Design a protein around this ligand. Structure first.
Ligand SMILES: CCOc1ccc(Cc2cc([C@@H]3O[C@H](SC)[C@@H](O)[C@H](O)[C@H]3O)ccc2Cl)cc1
Ligand SMILES: CC(=O)N[C@@H]1[C@@H](O)[C@H](O)[C@@H](CO)O[C@H]1O
Ligand code: NA
Lengths: 590, 29
């Protein structure tokens, strides 16, 4: 209702429309290349700003601040693994995907192994992962932030948001979305820094957070419900390792071997094998512009511990009877969720610490985060479906019908998400951020295991790669089905899930499943006859500098990934510096 | 002290990147 809020929300919309219009007036969207891969024309700053803005959603604000309040600062684990794995993207994987001349990541595996069946399998698994683990978190976290900050209807508001990100997606393609994401990253970081400032002022500095957080317990620890009674001191007092990234390897909530290995594995699928991030790396002007943007994204991916996790911990210090509630009656009154109220942490700092003018800015921040992520998913799924599935059904399709089918898939994936919104609203509290990271740790390691063997081990053949993926879905589905069967409960109400299934952290099962998919792929590969090198040029990390005539199991200016040695020198030295800073910060909080 | 933990982390990291330059210099050429 404030003049200022409304003006700040429409200045944001004027920026987004302004840069959209400039981009469509510049770029060509009458071709598949242009509409789907920005004409292969993006420079370092669009690539990195896009990689950041395509990743950071409303779920980062709601999830990381929620978990920061709940469990302290080891969820920075999620964001900081990425520094190391975005170096992998540039220096190891994108070299190979730029010489392969692929538009989709299923197409790479078609070129590398050569069946009809791996490319179709990967497309259908990818599309379901985007429904379950990427769209669901954005709809859920949007609904938290609208319910708390605004108090609007969380059905109508999600429809209206999903509808305007539909129009923003179909209207210009990757080009528009990338150049716009350079605005949306500025808006996200700007408003997030302003809220960090107010929060750290309220608790009385950085020193204030680290001398007040461990004391931040609720004073309402006794229930009116029989067979609950006195809530345990384990589950309302803050965790006594709350200021340490590296937690105990058997009893930690995030064990350190699980953090470092298991997140490197699942992050490897997310950053290096996944169409949503890798389409930002197939639209670059040159490999040196891809490596430069990898570094911008990676320095930007430090920011989330200081802009979401610590704010959420400051939220538990300031509203301990509302953010750290444990009694069911109290949690039903505070946030409508019997199982806890961590999720209101960021939403509540915004609705209590921000003045008349800047509340509008923080609405612009969450809108920018949510719009950028949903648009990146709707475009990447458009490409995935159109290029892979629609060219199986109609081979002689051609670059006009394909754009029509690309824009009609965005409409379909919006309507499917609208239909899926009540299911995701059935997830109760901060359980959902454990569900999404668990489903990721059960489905993705088989895909990580194939792409590392498809890229680094040229002995691996099509039978190996396919039975690797299906053996993995089988092992993974074991954990998923028996878990979802007993639900989660809370610390107050432990589930009856037998411990051997549960008690192994899902990031540890990520590691076992990766090595089991790897071993199966290698074993079936080594029994069956190999793929010779005449089939493999410029599609394996060994052969990315080949010049020899490949024979397809399925112009030359994209094949060339030679960079200027001066500019190579510069991106190589900034990568080592960026790693050194990441390693220093992991040391500081370990 | 946190600052010492940070610097030991960086020190072991510069040791590992010196090992990477050693291994590829003697084993790729
Ligand atoms: C307890 C869990 O709580 C949380 C875990 C993560 C997040 C933030 C988040 C991170 C990611 C990404 O996850 C991938 S791995 C799939 C990483 O590589 C990447 O750096 C992350 O940005 C995806 C969704 C979300 Cl909601 C919030 C709560
Ligand atoms: C329902 C129940 O067990 N209530 C107990 C109460 O009997 C006891 O006096 C108090 C002492 O801390 O702890 C609580
Ligand atoms: Na985003």
């Amino acid at each position: 209702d404030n003049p200022a809020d409304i003006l700040v929300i429409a200045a944001y919309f004027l920026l987004v429309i302004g840069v959209g219009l400039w981009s469509m007036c510049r770029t060509n969207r009458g071709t598949v290349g242009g509409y789907f891969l920005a004409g292969r024309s993006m420079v370092w700053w669009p690539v990195g700003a896009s990689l950041f803005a395509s990743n950071i959603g409303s779920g980062h604000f709601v999830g990381l601040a929620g978990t920061g309040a709940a469990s302290g600062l080891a969820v920075a684990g999620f964001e900081w693994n990425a520094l190391f794995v975005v170096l992998l993207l540039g220096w190891l994987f994108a070299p190979v995907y730029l010489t392969a001349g692929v538009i989709t990541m299923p197409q790479y595996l078609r070129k590398r192994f050569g069946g009809r069946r791996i490319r179709l399998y990967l497309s259908v698994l990818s599309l379901f992962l985007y429904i379950f683990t990427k769209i669901s978190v954005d709809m859920f976290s949007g609904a938290v932030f609208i319910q708390q900050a605004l108090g609007w209807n969380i059905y109508a508001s999600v429809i209206a948001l999903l509808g305007i990100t539909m129009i923003y997606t179909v209207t210009g393609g990757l080009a528009a979305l990338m150049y716009t994401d350079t605005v949306q990253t500025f808006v996200i970081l700007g408003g997030a820094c302003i809220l960090m400032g107010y929060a750290f002022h309220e608790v009385g500095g950085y020193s204030g957070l680290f001398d007040k957080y461990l004391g931040a317990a609720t004073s309402l620890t006794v229930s009116e419900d029989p067979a609950v009674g006195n809530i345990s001191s384990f589950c309302y007092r803050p965790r006594p390792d709350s200021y340490h990234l590296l937690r105990h390897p058997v009893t930690g909530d995030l064990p350190w071997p699980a953090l470092l290995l298991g997140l490197t594995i699942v992050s490897g699928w997310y950053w290096c094998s996944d169409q949503v991030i890798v389409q930002r790396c197939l639209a670059g002007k040159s490999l040196t512009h891809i490596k430069a943007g990898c570094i911008l994204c990676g320095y930007l991916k430090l920011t989330p511990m200081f802009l979401m996790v610590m704010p959420g911990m400051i939220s538990r210090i300031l509203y301990p009877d509302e953010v750290a509630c444990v009694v069911p009656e109290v949690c039903r009154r505070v946030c409508g969720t019997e199982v806890g109220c961590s999720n209101i942490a960021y939403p509540r700092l915004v609705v209590k610490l921000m003045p008349n003018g800047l509340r509008g800015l923080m609405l612009a921040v969450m809108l920018a985060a949510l719009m950028s992520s949903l648009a990146s998913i709707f475009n990447s799924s458009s490409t995935l479906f159109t290029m892979d599935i629609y060219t199986r059904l109609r081979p002689r399709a051609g670059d006009r019908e394909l754009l029509l089918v690309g824009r009609l898939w965005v409409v379909f994936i919006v309507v499917v998400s609208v239909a899926w919104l009540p299911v995701v609203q059935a997830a109760q509290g901060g359980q959902l951020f454990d569900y999404i990271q668990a489903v990721s740790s059960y489905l993705a390691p088989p895909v990580s295991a194939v792409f590392v063997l498809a890229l680094f081990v040229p002995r691996v053949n099509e039978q190996g790669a396919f039975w690797g993926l299906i053996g993995g879905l089988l092992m993974g589905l074991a954990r998923l089905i028996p878990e979802f069967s007993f639900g989660s409960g809370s610390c107050v109400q432990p589930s009856a899930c037998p411990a051997f299934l549960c008690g192994v952290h899902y990031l540890y099962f990520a590691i076992v499943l990766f090595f089991c998919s790897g071993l199966l792929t290698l074993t079936v590969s080594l029994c069956t006859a190999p793929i010779p090198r005449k089939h493999l040029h410029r599609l394996v990390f060994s052969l990315r500098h080949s010049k020899e005539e490949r024979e397809d199991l399925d112009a030359r200016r994209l094949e060339d990934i030679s960079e200027d040695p001066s500019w190579a020198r510069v991106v190589n030295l900034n990568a080592l510096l960026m790693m050194a800073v990441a390693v220093f910060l992991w040391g500081f909080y370990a | 002290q946190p600052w010492m933990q940070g610097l030991i982390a960086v020190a072991v990291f510069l040791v590992l990147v010196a090992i990477a330059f050693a291994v590829n210099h003697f084993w790729c050429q």
